């Protein structure tokens, strides 16, 4: 008879058990994180296995509804969220093979072990050591050797595994009403409900590169300045016509260029803004750090955290043999239980980390009234964006002086502002082209357009053309270079790490207009601004119940995905670089290589 009325009853029956079972699983995971021991291992085992073996029946029964007639949008979305069969669309043997291949690639990638040929008794791991040697040093031979070692003894076995992983995943997508794995990655980023806010999978596909050309000159100016600094430092190791090699960046895969700020610092005479002395001298412990960090949150307008979070959650000093994980995480156990997991120290870095964690807690509690299936952000790029906005607005010297963390007689000038802008850019814009090229290559390889053999050459040529990174040493076809990365053997969509920064400044820009603040965007602050909190919370409380296209309307007034505020942020840096690369050409030619 009825199919939409009983859908409500089925959803309620599922949610009532799902909430408490997820609470139990989260409690067990938190207990083992606090109690790293054998006894707490079976706790997570018997929580997670029960959760999966119970959600499997909920997924099974959530197909008896012909989801083409339910009038309610929320009910339809909730039922579709469970109508997916996950990876249970292939055969049992195919699924077992896929699980085994993912397990073996995950185990292999986490077993870095390369010795020096002269001393084969000292291998090195991806832990500090091998990475530390090539990340913090002024050398060209040993750093290149380490770069080759991590990409040769580990980069050869990942290719056969990835070759079967790609084809099996694409076959699963084809059996899953998807042309490829890329559209499955974008299945979440597709809303087809209310008119005017419809988003298709190809919209992001053809919009990522549409807005990419605008950020090209900003990256090119920084690239030219870094290359000129490399001439100033490395004698005749980089061609001015071309570009700098890969391993000389400072990172194994060239994601970040922050470690190269030491060799590219314009004005090192003025010290960077550090309040470690201020907090240490005035006796600021971890609890005082949290208390002073939440003052900004309550001044913006976010509600104060309830009692119980300060008690159940661990804060600082794991201390004795009872160890604890130091990974900053935000726990939403359910039933009104929120907790933090931190190893807080007396540091500005820990200050910003605590601000990020508080932002995560606030956004997690924002959608508390949502159902179990809708207690999440509108998309994947809002939690981290909200977390980093507070860190951006807390590192401003004006806020530090406001909270009495800086000397009131400060004489901040354009020199230190330019230096801080350059340092922030070296971390922010230094990864956006790399993220774009990696995501584009993954999309193309999962689309099947490029054959199995034509993998390395296309990747290298498009990295040279877009990012401008040349190969310090020649590479052969059997190398699987992109596979030697964290979010390639763990099945992680990496486009999410691209839009959120573009959202961040937009939000900041909007917050700037919701700040009544006149001046530079980096000095724009929302301290004591209640409107900035109310406008944000009006969308934060919505959660995933509303489309993210509709969600991105109460803060920024433009639905279009255009990179307005990123260039506005680095305007002093852009105008200083224009006066810097006057006699040095901006750009690169894909014709010069260190080996040829």
């Amino acid at each position: 008879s009825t199919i939409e009325e009983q859908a409500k009853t089925f959803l309620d029956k599922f949610n009532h058990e799902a909430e408490d079972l997820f609470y139990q699983s989260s409690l067990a995971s938190w207990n083992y994180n606090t109690n790293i021991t054998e006894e707490n291992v079976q706790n997570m085992n018997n929580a997670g296995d029960k959760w999966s073996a119970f959600l499997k029946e909920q997924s099974t029964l959530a197909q008896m509804y012909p989801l083409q007639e339910i009038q309610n949008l929320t009910v339809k979305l909730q039922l579709q969220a469970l109508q997916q069969n996950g990876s249970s669309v292939l055969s049992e043997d195919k699924s077992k093979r896929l699980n085994t291949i993912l397990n073996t690639m995950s185990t292999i990638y986490s077993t870095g072990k390369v010795c020096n040929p002269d001393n084969p008794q000292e291998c090195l791991l991806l832990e500090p050591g091998l990475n530390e040697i090539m990340a913090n040093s002024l050398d060209y031979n040993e750093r290149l050797w380490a770069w080759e070692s991590w990409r040769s003894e580990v980069g050869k076995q990942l290719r056969p595994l990835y070759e079967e992983y790609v084809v099996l995943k694409n076959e699963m997508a084809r059996a899953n009403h998807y042309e490829d794995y890329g559209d499955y990655w974008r299945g979440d980023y597709e809303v087809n409900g209310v008119d005017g806010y419809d988003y298709s999978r190809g919209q992001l596909i053809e919009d990522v590169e549409h807005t990419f050309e605008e950020i090209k000159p900003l990256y090119e100016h920084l690239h030219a300045y870094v290359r000129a600094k490399l001439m100033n430092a490395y004698p005749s190791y980089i061609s001015p016509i071309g570009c700098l090699p890969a391993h000389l960046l400072g990172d194994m895969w060239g994601r970040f260029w922050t470690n190269l700020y030491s060799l590219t610092v314009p004005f090192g005479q003025k010290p960077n803004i550090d309040v470690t002395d201020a907090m240490v001298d005035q006796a600021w412990d971890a609890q005082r750090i949290f208390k002073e960090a939440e003052k900004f949150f309550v001044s913006v307008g976010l509600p104060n955290m309830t009692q119980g979070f300060w008690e159940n959650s661990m804060l600082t000093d794991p201390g004795n043999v009872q160890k604890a994980v130091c990974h900053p995480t935000a726990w939403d156990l359910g039933k009104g239980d929120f907790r933090i997991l931190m190893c807080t120290k007396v540091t500005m870095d820990d200050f910003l980390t605590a601000h990020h964690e508080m932002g995560h807690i606030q956004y997690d509690m924002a959608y508390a009234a949502q159902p179990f299936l809708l207690r999440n952000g509108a998309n994947e790029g809002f939690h981290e964006a909200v977390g980093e906005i507070m860190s951006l607005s807390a590192a401003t010297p004006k806020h530090l002086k406001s909270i009495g963390l800086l000397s009131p007689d400060f004489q901040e000038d354009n020199e230190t502002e330019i230096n801080f802008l350059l340092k922030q850019a070296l971390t922010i814009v230094g990864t956006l082209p790399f993220t774009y090229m990696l995501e584009k290559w993954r999309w193309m390889v999962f689309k099947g357009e490029i054959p199995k053999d034509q993998w390395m050459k296309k990747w290298w040529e498009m990295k040279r053309e877009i990012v401008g990174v040349v190969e310090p040493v020649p590479h052969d076809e059997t190398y699987c270079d992109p596979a030697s990365l964290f979010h390639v053997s763990n099945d992680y969509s990496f486009i999410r790490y691209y839009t959120r920064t573009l959202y961040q400044f937009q939000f900041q820009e909007a917050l700037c207009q919701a700040a009544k603040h006149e001046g530079p965007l980096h000095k724009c602050d929302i301290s004591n601004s209640t409107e900035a909190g109310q406008k944000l919370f009006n969308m934060l409380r919505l959660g995933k119940s509303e489309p993210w296209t509709l969600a991105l309307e109460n803060v920024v007034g433009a639905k279009n995905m255009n990179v307005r505020p990123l260039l506005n942020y680095f305007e002093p840096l852009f105008t200083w670089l224009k006066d810097q690369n006057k006699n040095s050409f901006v750009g690169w030619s894909t014709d010069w290589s260190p080996y040829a």
Partner: protein, 98 residues
């Protein structure tokens, strides 16, 4: 470890009358498929047990609630509040409410 000794009705065919109590454990039939007292294609249990724990947040922890309803039926009144009395005095013209 989790207390599940308190249950609440989640589904019933008809709403409760003013001052009405339902304790029947009859299996609910959400859909049009009748069930012979067992869960099935469209049958679910009306009663759900809370999972009250000391670690639960505000608004989820158990609360003891007592409702006092006062009735004044035509029968003679039985329950009335206390009446306080003062001290007596003598040999002075006063007014009294013995």
């Amino acid at each position: 470890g989790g207390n599940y000794n308190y249950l609440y009705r989640l589904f019933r065919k008809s709403n409760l009358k003013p001052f009405e109590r339902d304790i029947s454990t009859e299996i609910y039939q959400a859909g049009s498929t009748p069930c012979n007292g067992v869960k099935g294609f469209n049958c679910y249990f009306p009663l759900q047990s809370y999972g009250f724990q000391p670690t639960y947040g505000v608004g989820y922890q158990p609360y003891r609630v007592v409702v006092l309803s006062f009735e004044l039926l035509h029968a003679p009144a039985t329950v009335c509040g206390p009446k306080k009395s003062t001290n007596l005095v003598k040999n002075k013209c006063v007014n009294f409410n013995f």
